[PDB]
Every structure is written in C-alpha cells, then in structure tokens.
Amino acid sequence: PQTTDAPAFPSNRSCPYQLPDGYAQLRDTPGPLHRVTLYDGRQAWVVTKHEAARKLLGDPRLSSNATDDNFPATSPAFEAVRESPQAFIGLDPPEHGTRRRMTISEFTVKRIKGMRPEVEEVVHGFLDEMLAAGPTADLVSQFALPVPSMVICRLLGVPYADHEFFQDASKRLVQSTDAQSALTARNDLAGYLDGLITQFQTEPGAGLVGALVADQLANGEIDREELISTAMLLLIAGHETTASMTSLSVITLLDHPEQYAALRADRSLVPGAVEELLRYLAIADIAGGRVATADIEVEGQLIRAGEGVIVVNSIANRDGTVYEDPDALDIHRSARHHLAFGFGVHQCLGQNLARLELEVILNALMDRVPTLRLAVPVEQLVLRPGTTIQGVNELPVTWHH
Ligand code: HEM
Ligand SMILES: C=C1/C(=C\C=C2/CCC[C@]3(C)[C@@H]([C@H](C)CCCC(C)(C)O)CC[C@@H]23)C[C@@H](O)C[C@@H]1O
C-alpha cells in the first residue's frame, strides 16, 4: 500500500474557493499539527487548527529566518529568498522591528483613509478604459493587476511607466517552479530597484523608497541590499495579493449569485464581505513558514529544535470550531479573527490597504458593470498550484456592451 502518515505538501486547488482534497483531509484530522513531506523529501509540520495557529505564530521559538538550512522551503524557487539579504518578513526580533518600523508610516489608518480618493480614481480609470473597449476582456491583465500596481507604485515612488517590466519580473519570481528562473527574475528586479536608489541619491523624490534613501540609507541604518529586498517585498506584495483577491472574489461571488445580489442591495455589507472573502479564499495560505529554534510542546506533540513548521492559514480558516459550517461562504457571518493575514509580529503590514482596495473594487464593479459575468466555464479556468499565491493568471469576462 501507498498510504503515508506524511502526505506530500503543498497540494493544488481544483476549485478556486475550496481546500484541495489533501487540505480537507488535514483539516479533518484531530490535533493542531500534522506531518507532511516537502518537495525535497524532508518532513515538516503543518499547523491545521485555528487557535493553535495563533499560538504558534505568536511563539518566538518559531523563527521566520528563511536562510536557516532547516527552514521549510516548499519549492526550489525559494532559493531566490535565501540567497539575498532578507526583507523584514524573514527577520526576527529585534532586527525585524527596526526594519518594519521604517515602513509603517505609509500604512497607518490615517494614511489609508487619505488614499481612498486615489484608489477610487485608479479603480474607475482602469474601468472606464476596460468598458470603453467593450466585452471579452481579461480581468487579470486589464484591471486586477494594474489597479493595485499603480497604487503601490505611488506609495513606493516606483515609476508606473516601468510597469510592464516589473509586473513581468514579479510574476516570474513568484510563480517560478525552478531555482534559476527565480534567481534571474529576482536579479532583474534587484538591478532595477538598485538604479532607482542611485537616482534618488542624486535627486530626492517622493515615495517610501525615496524616503528610505534620503534618511535611513544615508545614515547607514539600513544596508543598500536590505533596501532593495524591502522595496521588492512591498512592490510584489502590494501588486499580487490584491490582484489575486480581486479575480478570485469575482469568480466566487458569481458562483454565489444570491449573496452577490444581497451585497449589491446593501453596500454596508461590503466590508464584512471582504473579511469573509479573505477568510474563505486565503490566497497566501503557505506564507507561514517557520523553523523552531528550541523544542516546543503542542498539545502532547513535540516540535523539535531545527524542525520546519508551516502555519496553513487556509486550513486554519476552515476550522469549524471557529467558523460554523466553515466551508460555506456567508458574507453575513463574522469572519473576524481569520488568519488570511497571519497573526502576531509579522501580521500583514498591507492589510488595511488591501481592505480599502477590495472595498472600492467591489463597489465599483457592482456600480459600473452589474452585468459582469465570466466568459468561460469556471472549470476551464487554470488555477495556480499550491506552491504559490493562489489565483488565476487569466479571467475571461464579458458584460452588456
Ligand atoms: C490582499 C491580500 C493579502 C494577503 C492575503 C496577505 C497575506 C499576508 C500574510 C499571511 C502575511 C504574513 C506572512 C508571515 O507571517 O510570514 C503577510 C505579511 C506581509 N504582507 Fe500581506 N497580504 C495581503 C496584502 C498585502 C499588501 C496589499 C501589502 C502591501 C505591500 C502587503 C504587505 C505585507 C508585508 C510587508 C508583510 C510582512 C510583515 C512582516 O513580516 O512584518 N500585503 N501578508
Ligand atoms: C519578494 C521577495 C523575494 C522572493 C519571493 C518569492 C519567491 C519564492 C516563493 C514566494 C516566497 C511566494 C510563496 C507563496 C511563499 C511560500 C512560503 C513558504 C516557503 C514558507 O512556503 C511568495 C513570494 C515568493 C526575493 C527576496 O529577496 C525579497 C522578497 O522577500
């Protein structure tokens, strides 16, 4: 027999908004942890329950150090992370905090509120272009990706002019299946960001990157390579996550036409619906890799120092002890406390920006294209595999022209 007690991980979605069969199995298995086998044949733990996920994401014994030999890399591409200085996503206290604090001013509640008119302007701008061209469009390339790309570019002070280049490099890096393809795309982005830094040293400019160059870099409080990594982190997260959420959300809402109509009829529901969609879709479900620096006992199971642990937030967000009937989309439910953005010191920096963008996007689509529908069968869409940010690279849509 082929039965194993350490199943291959990650697994692929076969339905854009449902756990892969293997994740459903792990969700159903009693206890906080379960053994898996990574791509290289090393075993690691996955965390498969909601409260245990919060506990372990809060445990300083679980390091985010992606350079550790025992870090649970889920594919060969991750070499692109371990081969350069880490952005703060890969740091632990105290270095984590000193780096994260250099960026937090761009993401304050007050700043997010202040970006509402810009995000609304950008959303409607790309809509009026898409709709003026008329039906059979790819929602990914024409809307889902350019909108948050333009927004994060202004926040960072990266020229939107260069979008074709950095969007292509972003995709190759994040979606690469092999180490050399990842290293190249990372190197391409690095050289670009490097030139931007030098440009800012000659002529000060707006945006976070400009601010970091003029201040912390000039004081030697951040390494040039760290600034590159930090900018690359924010550029890619700023783009890809919201893009993925937009496309997946349209697919999922259109498969739930009853709740979609309800959303349209009562816009006060959109913020809650956005939380439910974040819970349900969990697009960064394997962005929870850690390595134990010390033994950790977990409800009778022992994680040993030097063992890898992945906090699987998709599985955790389907914990029925927390979300009653967890596999049912319900935009009226309280999706509060979900783990789509992590928990603790590395909890998503961009979360409130994501929430603003998705609220504006949903309202705009319902306002401007109420007859939006997919132009192909859900079954014919190609879903990205489990080793990356979840989503689709193409989304054929049409509407009443
Ligand atoms: C749109 C949906 C998004 C999802 C589902 C999401 C998910 C996550 C998750 C699960 C983590 C934690 C990773 C860990 O614990 O190792 C994270 C961290 C992070 N995310 Fe988000 N993200 C989203 C949007 C954004 C946006 C729009 C940005 C803007 C740049 C952003 C920036 C970051 C950064 C900088 C971190 C690292 C925080 C730290 O390590 O201190 N994210 N995200
Ligand atoms: C942007 C950065 C870089 C790489 C990001 C990648 C490449 C590999 C796969 C990653 C890490 C994606 C995976 C979905 C996350 C898998 C996480 C894990 C290995 C724990 O299951 C998200 C972003 C992707 C390069 C780094 O130098 C700066 C910044 O860091």
Atom of ligand 1 nearest to the CA of 358: 1
User: Residue 203 burial (CB < 10 Å; 0-12/13-18/19+)?
Assistant: exposed
Q: Is 153 annotated as a binding residue?
A: no
Residue pair 56/309 in contact by the 8 Å Cβ criterion: yes
CA distances from 61 to 249, 289, 292, 294, 295 (A): 35, 13, 6, 6, 8
> Measured between alpha carbons, how far is 211 from 219 in angstroms, rounded to an integer?
12
> Domain ranges in the chain?
1-401
Altogether, the residues listed in the chain come to a count of 401
**328 is written with which tokens?**
């049912």
Question: Does the beta carbon of 126 lie inside 6 Å of ligand 2?
Answer: no
Where the chain is discontinuous (C–N > 2.5 Å), the residues before each break are none
Read off the amino acid at residue 12: N
> Measured between alpha carbons, how far is 345 from 58 in angstroms, rounded to an integer?
7
- Which ligand neighbours the alpha carbon of 244 most closely? 1
Q: How far is CA 159 from the centre of its chain?
A: 22
Read off the amino acid at residue 301: Q
Resolution, expressed in angstroms to one decimal: 1.7
State in words which class domain 1-401 has. mainly alpha
Question: Does the beta carbon of 100 lie inside 6 Å of ligand 1?
Answer: yes
Q: Is 348 annotated as a binding residue?
A: yes
**24 is written with which tokens?**
């459903």
- Which ligand neighbours the alpha carbon of 342 most closely? 1
Distance between Cα 81 and ligand 2 center (Å): 6
Which DSSP category does 84 fall into? S
Residue pair 78/367 in contact by the 8 Å Cβ criterion: no
Solved by what technique? Answer: X-ray
Residue pair 99/91 in contact by the 8 Å Cβ criterion: yes
Count of other CB atoms within 10 angstroms of residue 125 = 13
With CA atoms as reference, report the closest residue to 304 among 50, 10, 6, 61.
61
Distance between Cα 203 and ligand 1 center (Å): 30
Question: Does the beta carbon of 170 lie inside 6 Å of ligand 2?
Answer: no
* Nearest CA owner, ligand 2 atom 16: 287
Q: What angle do CA 81, 85, 90 make, to 5 degrees?
A: 60
**133 is written with which tokens?**
């061209």
Q: How far is CA 269 from the centre of its chain?
A: 23
**3-class SS at 62?**
strand
With CA atoms as reference, report the closest residue to 240 among 193, 283, 187, 198.
283
| Per-residue buried b or exposed e for 149-181, using 16+ beta carbons within 10 Å of the residue's own CB | bbbbbbbbbbeeeebeebbebbbbbbbbeebeb
Q: Is 74 annotated as a binding residue?
A: yes
CA atoms within 13 A on the CB side of 76: 8
Residue pair 229/212 in contact by the 8 Å Cβ criterion: no
What's phi and psi for 197, nearest 5 deg? Answer: -60, -50
Which DSSP category does 144 fall into? I
Atom of ligand 2 nearest to the CA of 287: 17
Residue pair 126/151 in contact by the 8 Å Cβ criterion: no
> Measured between alpha carbons, how far is 233 from 223 in angstroms, rounded to an integer?
15
Q: What angle do CA 139, 142, 147 make, to 5 degrees?
A: 100
**3-class SS at 8?**
strand
Which DSSP category does 85 fall into? P
Residue pair 313/288 in contact by the 8 Å Cβ criterion: yes
Q: Is 172 annotated as a binding residue?
A: no
What's phi and psi for 303, nearest 5 deg? Answer: -90, 125
